[PDB]
Amino acid sequence: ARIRDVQGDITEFQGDAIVNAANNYLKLGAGVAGAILRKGGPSIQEECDRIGKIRVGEAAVTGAGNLPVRYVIHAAVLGDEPASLETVRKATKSALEKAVELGLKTVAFTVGGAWVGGLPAEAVCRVMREEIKKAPDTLEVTGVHGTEKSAEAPRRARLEHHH
């Protein structure tokens, strides 16, 4: 799947889905996860409660409340172990599955927040981008970086090489 790479804020993104890293509990922490709860509204957190706990690796789909999207896809990445590379691979793959299930065209990923904790940051961006590129091209993934320099780095490591 083709991958756009911009500096922005996920809660401004216009499209079909935003994909955020949460825990398996689905209880919106701090940072961007909090920025989502706040601008999306209480509705989002209520849907996460009704869903209840899922397993690390899996992903859960709730509505978007006051956010300019339809859905938020909660990719459960940390829980007990918690943030492994394989864990992140499962969570991106499950998130994309869920986008393909729902007939989506444009989805947005948050980039290197709770997705990256404890882990090497280039290494994670790479497993995610490896997972996304396997997805159906019917999808159109935007990676939404916080800082402008982190938004330039993938634009750069794709003019590279390659085993």
DSSP 2-39: -EEEEES-TTT--SSEEEEEEETT----STHHHHHHHH
Structure tokens at 19: 């994909």
Asked whether the beta carbons of 92 and 56 are under 8 A apart, the reply is: no
Asked whether the beta carbons of 106 and 95 are under 8 A apart, the reply is: no
Cα separation of 20 and 30, whole Å?
A: 12
Asked whether the beta carbons of 64 and 70 are under 8 A apart, the reply is: yes
Backbone angles phi, psi at 10, to 5 degrees: -60, -25
Is 1-163 a domain of CATH 3.40.50.720?
A: no
Ramachandran class of 103: left when φ > 0, alpha when ψ lies in -120 to 50, beta otherwise: left
Closest by alpha carbon to 32, among 13, 50, 47, 56? 13
The most distant pair of C-alpha atoms in the chain lies apart, rounded to whole Å, by 47
Cα separation of 155 and 30, whole Å?
A: 28
Asked whether the beta carbons of 84 and 100 are under 8 A apart, the reply is: no
